[PDB]
Amino acid sequence: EFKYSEVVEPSTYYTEGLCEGIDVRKSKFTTLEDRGAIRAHEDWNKHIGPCREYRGTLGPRFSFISVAVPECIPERLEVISYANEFAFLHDDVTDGKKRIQSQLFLEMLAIDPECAKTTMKSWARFVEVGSSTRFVELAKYIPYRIMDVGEMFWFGLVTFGLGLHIPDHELELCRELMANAWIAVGLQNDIWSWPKERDAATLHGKDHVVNAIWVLMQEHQTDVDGAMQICRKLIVEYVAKYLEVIEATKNDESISLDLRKYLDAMLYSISGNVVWSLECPRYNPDVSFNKTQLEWMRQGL
Ligand SMILES: NCCC(O)(P(=O)(O)O)P(=O)(O)O
Ligand SMILES: [Cl-]
Ligand SMILES: [Mg+2]
Ligand SMILES: [Mg+2]
Ligand SMILES: [Mg+2]
């Protein structure tokens, strides 16, 4: 079942109890994410503007894709990391000679035509219905944040990296079974991106912060630490909830073999998001990169 990654020893990483019952798996080719990610920096620095040693998907020990999508097809590992950085590089713009990224798309047709064609169209619904605020109730924030984190982007990204062909009729079915998983990673990110996003709202003149922490502070009339405790409590529960879905969806043949794989692959995106966000320079400024990672950022590839 797993032939592209290994299980990381539980006594070597911190979980904070936010992914109980899930193994932490790391891609056996993590150096491919580096080159793919760093080349996105260089292409950024060469075509749109300054970009050197950017803190995004990369980590010194756990890079996002290498640990969130550990069973990614090795030959596709570089190009997925290339796209993931541009995703990270664009979310910061959210918070033009850039149309010359058709080289990314055309590269994916050289690998898999049908998988890419759906993914590119999966990103159509993402980009086009993304541009179209301020939440004080959590029940209303969950539907929004589910989109704002990038579910459609991730769907097209993983399915290509795993080579999954889900029939067009299960597309509405799939999104209604990873609700608990997507709520989990959404609250997780809102906790660890909170400092950089709270600092962000301080400059724009924002009286609000589009973050679960701020939302909970308004809805429950509590402070920062009070919201953190509530948020962490919900994550554990929603993580548990999704784990029940897995055992229930283990044996249905009307379910695609691919979709059944994709549901299982969502587990390690949860455990991966935990170990990554706890170390990544994106949320942890004081953390430095690898010798190898730097040597390619400074000296190039
Ligand atoms: N996975 C999306 C997370 C973010 O992009 P977002 O701002 O939560 O969309 P981050 O700023 O935390 O990197
Ligand atoms: Cl821990
Ligand atoms: Mg952001
Ligand atoms: Mg954002
Ligand atoms: Mg965030």
DSSP string, 228-297: HHHHHHHHHHHHHHHHHHHHHSSS-SSS-HHHHHHHHHTHHHHHHHHHHHTT-TTT-TT----HHHHHHH
> What is the 196 CA–ligand 4 centroid distance (Å)?
11
Long-range CB contacts for residues 10-18, cutoff 8 Å, separation at least 24: 13/62, 13/275, 13/278, 14/275, 14/278, 15/271, 15/274, 15/275, 16/232, 16/274, 16/278, 17/236, 18/188, 18/232, 18/235, 18/236, 18/239, 18/274
Q: For residue 240, what are the CA distances in angstroms to 73, 126, 275?
A: 28, 28, 18
Q: Contact at 8 Å (CB) between 11 and 5? A: no
Experimental method: X-ray
- Cα distances from 28 to residues 3, 6, 231, in angstroms, run 9, 7, 33
Among residues 4, 276, 20, which one has the least CA distance to residue 163?
Answer: 4
Asked if residues 197 and 209 have their Cβ atoms less than 8 Å apart, the reply is: yes
Look at the chain and report how many structural domains it folds into. 1
Ligand 1 pocket check for 149: Cβ under 6 Å: yes
Q: Name the residue range of residue 70's domain.
A: 1-301
Pocket test for ligand 1, best of 58, 148, 149 (most atoms within 8 A of CB): 149
Q: Which ligand 1 atom is the nearest neighbour of the CA of 94?
A: 7
Cβ contact 34:63 at 8 Å = yes
Look up residue 266 and give its two tokens: 């969502």
Instruction: List, as residue ranges, the binding site for Mg(2+).
Output: 91, 95
CB of residue 193 inside a 6 A radius of ligand 1: yes
Please report, for residues 109, 168, 220, the alpha-carbon distance to residue 112 in angstroms, rounded to integers and kept in the order given. Answer: 5, 17, 49
Is the CB of residue 24 less than 8 Å from the CB of residue 8?
yes
Please name every residue paired with 27 in a beta bridge, in sequence order, or none if there are none.
Answer: 5
Where residue 70 sits, what CATH number does that domain have?
Answer: 1.10.600.10
Closest CA to ligand 1's atom 1: 149
Ligand 1 pocket, mutate which of 89, 187, 193, 211 (most atoms under 8 A from CB):
193
Q: 112: exposed, middle or buried (C-beta count within 10 Å: 0-12, 13-18, 19+)?
A: middle
Q: Which two tokens stand for residue 56?
A: 């995004």
Ligand 1 atom nearest 95 alpha carbon: 7
